[PDB]
Amino acid sequence: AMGQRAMKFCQGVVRELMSKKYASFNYPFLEPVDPVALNCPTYFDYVKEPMDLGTVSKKLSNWEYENLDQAEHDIRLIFQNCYAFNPDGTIVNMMGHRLEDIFNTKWADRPLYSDV
């Protein structure tokens, strides 16, 4: 039962991370990974909870997050999944760190209280 202030804040963070301003490095994180189409057929030997920014935005809009900590964890999972499958130094790994850098900056503005 997340409240309006927390909801608006979260949607704002997700909207920021998906915005075209970051298109040159956020495009791997906008939609669900498709292992076969991306020629990474072993993706789900490394990842067991897929998450992407579009999915966080849908769960948000469907009132599926109880509170801000829960939302933060789904967003953070996008990047843990990235590093679980893409080694250091690869392009997608580095894109993930750059987008996470922005997430870290934006998330520190969160309301102290996750209203209900």
Residue numbers in the entry: 301 to 416
What did the authors write?
We used a peptide array comprising histone sequences with diverse post‐translational modifications to probe the ligand selectivity of C. glabrata Bdf1 (CgBdf1) BD1 and BD2 (CgBD1 and CgBD2). Like other BET BDs, the two CgBDs displayed weak binding to mono‐acetylated peptides, enhanced binding to di‐ and tri‐acetylated peptides, and strongest binding to a tetra‐acetylated H4 peptide (H4ac4; acetylated on K5, K8, K12 and K16). Substituting a conserved tyrosine implicated in acetyllysine recognition by a phenylalanine (“Y/F” mutations Y166F and Y343F) abolished the interaction with acetylated peptides on the array and in pull‐down assays, demonstrating binding specificity. Crystal structures of CgBD1 and CgBD2 confirmed the expected BD fold (comprising helices Z, A, B and C), allowed comparison with human BET and C. albicans Bdf1 (CaBdf1) BD structures, and revealed details of the ligand binding pockets defined by the ZA and BC loops, including six structurally conserved water molecules. CgBD2 undergoes a minor conformational change to accommodate IBET‐151: in unbound CgBD2, the side chain of “YPF‐shelf” residue Tyr327 adopts a gauche minus (g−) conformation, stabilized by a sulfur‐π interaction with residue Met395, whereas, in the complex, Tyr327 adopts the trans conformation to avoid a steric clash with I‐BET151, thereby widening the ligand binding pocket.
The fungal Bromodomain and Extra‐Terminal (BET) protein Bdf1 is a potential antifungal target against invasive fungal infections. One attractive target is the fungal BET protein Bdf1, a global transcriptional regulator. BET proteins bind chromatin through their two bromodomains (BDs), BD1 and BD2, which specifically recognize histones acetylated on lysines. We show that Bdf1 is essential in C. glabrata, and that inactivation of both Bdf1 BDs induces lethality.
